[PDB]
Amino acid sequence: GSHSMRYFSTSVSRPGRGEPRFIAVGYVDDTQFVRFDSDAASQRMEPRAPWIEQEGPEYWDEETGKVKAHSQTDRENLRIALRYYNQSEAGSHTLQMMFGCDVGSDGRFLRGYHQYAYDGKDYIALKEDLRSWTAADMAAQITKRKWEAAHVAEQQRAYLEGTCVDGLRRYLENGKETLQRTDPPKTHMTHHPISDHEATLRCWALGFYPAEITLTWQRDGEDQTQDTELVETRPAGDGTFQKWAAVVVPSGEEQRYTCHVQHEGLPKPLTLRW
């Protein structure tokens, strides 16, 4: 199937307590592989996946340089965003950044990304055509005019269709063993009475990768939102993922209910019944 590479960076200001905390991480698909933390001692881009340790010193030196500089840029943007928004120097703000590309099965470029959020809200983003920007509001509009002047979009477009996708394909190769594995969910059902008239049915998916999965309940061959609970997909910690879904069900009507599991590691979609 497809793949993605993502970099995420977060800056949180803390006035009185010194410099913004900065943390960057990078993923290939759902597997994390680098991190940088402004508050840690190394002050280095650090490896977080086995198949990235094999990069030469020149690689670690440059990635550190880029990400240190980026933290100063977002340090700067924090100050600027205070001014654009006319906010006091007393409080605390977050600036988040996201950058990356998706490729297809052939390894060819599918899509590029580059966006910002301030205080958890959309700020500016590169549109799908990687030619123009979307600015959430009046403040981001100023930045939008700037980046249009500076031809930022065209730089970033060339990076995304080039370097991004080349690094991505190179990483997918370096970690073949691991990143192209496709673990199907192992499934089972559990059952608990809640009263004399009702019971809970819980439908479990375990040990799958990648995280993308769909669990859906049917009554008598029809979807059901009503009386369902569905938790966020969660990491097991060993590199696999977990999820479940549950319905509260009248007693002795268990057999009408079915849980449908979908996942790309699965030849046919699965159906569980109690």
Partner: peptide, 10 residues
């Protein structure tokens, strides 16, 4: 490889 973000001034 982390992006090149020098001209990402607000």
């Amino acid at each position: 490889r982390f992006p090149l973000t020098f001209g990402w001034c607000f």
